[PDB]
Amino acid sequence: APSILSTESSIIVIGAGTWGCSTALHLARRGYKDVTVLDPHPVPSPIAAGNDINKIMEHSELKDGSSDPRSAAFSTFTRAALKAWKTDPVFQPYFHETGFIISGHTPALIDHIRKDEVEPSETNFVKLETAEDFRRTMPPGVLTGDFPGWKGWLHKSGAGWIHAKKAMISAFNEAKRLGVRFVTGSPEGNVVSLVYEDGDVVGARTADGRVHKAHRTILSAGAGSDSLLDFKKQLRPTAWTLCHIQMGPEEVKQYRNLPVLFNIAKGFFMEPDEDKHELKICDEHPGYCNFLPCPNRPGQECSVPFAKHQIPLEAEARARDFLHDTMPHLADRPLSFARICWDADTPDRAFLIDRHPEHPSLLVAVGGSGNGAMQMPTIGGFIADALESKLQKEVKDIVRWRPETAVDRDWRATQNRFGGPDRIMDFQQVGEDQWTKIGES
Ligand SMILES: Cc1cc2nc3c(=O)[nH]c(=O)nc-3n(C[C@H](O)[C@H](O)[C@H](O)COP(=O)(O)OP(=O)(O)OC[C@H]3O[C@@H](n4cnc5c(N)ncnc54)[C@H](O)[C@@H]3O)c2cc1C
């Protein structure tokens, strides 16, 4: 029998990343007086995927939606997220409604975007057919490439980019100010395992040995969640790569209020951040896994997350071939920063927010699956809903606990992503001299 939930209930959130801070904030705002958040790092965490100078936000509605319940759930998440990016003062300053370009460069990719993304959407786009159509979405001198074989779609409003790092900091700040307790650092906040009494989770044991007891334990640790609970293959830690190119104080002025340019098989980039003038590029691919035997001594293989402020040279290559099609004049610029970035993919890349059906006091909130950052303002809300057993019908069944969809899971399934070798890649098959070497020299 799980304890009756009230505002006095001591709550623990494991993980103060994108989803953790969002939850801490929402719990605070609802009247919960006893919320403690645990993280092995101070905000922003160096391993939190939400720690990026920028991420893409997009919201689309559907024609129908009875035709695709997975996607109808996503609109529900994003309709909420967009509204909050525009009205909630904690999040508002860090949304940049600059627009979103989705595109490809081969017949089958372009037809894919037409069929899966554009046709089903109630959104009205501007069809980009030529190299001038791409170049003229941005000020003179920003896009200067030939865009070979490229065809795309511009989405003006209800899409843009977000300063995820700062918004995560802003939410942390407001949660902390409304009275949430943040235990962020090692060993105090580094949770090494959960705590069981009578088949349920009574709290969290951290690396310092203390058992933090709670009536409800919320687990939101991103890629790290896999090594804290048996998720039954429902979470694939996968990594993606990014790198920063620093701009000059003179040239950087032209790269302002730029719409997100995404080619689903080459990558995307976002406008230079206001602080360091750094321009960010991700080479799009199905992702990097780090295949090792699981930490629990099996012959089962797993993707184990590690941290690195470098990227494989093969990713720098893919980034620069992207640069070359779009902004050739920046193609041979030296990188100023790079790192690998860890998320968790579910078998269908819908979120995982549910009470564990064997430990009712545990609430997992994980599996952002590449689309979790934009949800920042409001994800904590649906998480609070789930906790408060009122997760609305439009999403409940889609994001529920579902280990049967991960039976016989192919860890190398491309999960609707394209680019590079068009296969899942493995960090183990990348040499130690085959990474970038940023600084110095
Ligand atoms: C390269 C890249 C680009 C992306 N671009 C976008 C985008 O444009 N738009 C979008 O919506 N999404 C995007 N995503 C997904 C995005 O990163 C989301 O932020 C991700 O889904 C975040 O979910 P999260 O809060 O659960 O994880 P995180 O933000 O990573 O938070 C995890 C936190 O849990 C902590 N933690 C870890 N381990 C332990 C432990 N043992 N005990 C306690 N605590 C712990 C971590 O330190 C961290 O603070 C992108 C992802 C990547 C990798």
Residue numbers in the entry: 2 to 442
Give me lines lifted from the publication on this model.
To confirm the formation of the designed disulfide bond in the SS03 and in the SS17 mutants and to assess any possible change that such modifications may have caused to their global molecular architecture relative to the wild-type enzyme, we solved the crystal structures of these two thermostabilized species. The crystal structures of the SS03 and the SS17 mutants were determined at 2.15 and 2.85 Å resolution, respectively. Focusing on the region where the mutations were introduced, the SS03 mutant (S67C/P121C) is highly superimposable to the wild type enzyme (residues 62 to 72 and 116 to 126, RMSD = 0.842) while the SS17 variant (D295C/K303C) shows a structural rearrangement in the region from residue 290 to 308, with an RMSD of 1.657 Å. Interestingly, while the introduction of the disulfide bond in the SS03 mutant does not cause any significant structural rearrangement in any portion of the enzyme, the formation of the disulfide bond in the SS17 mutant affects the conformation of one of the loops that define the boundaries of the tunnel leading to the catalytic pocket (residues 63 to 69) (orange circle). The RMSD between the SS17 mutant and the wild type enzyme for this short region is 2.745 Å. For the SS03 and the SS17 species, the mutations did not significantly affect the apparent steady state parameters relative to the WT. The SS17 variant, which shows an increase of ~8 °C in the T50 value and, contrary to all other tested mutants, a gradual decrease in residual activity at increasing temperatures, features detectable activity even after thermal treatment at 95 °C.
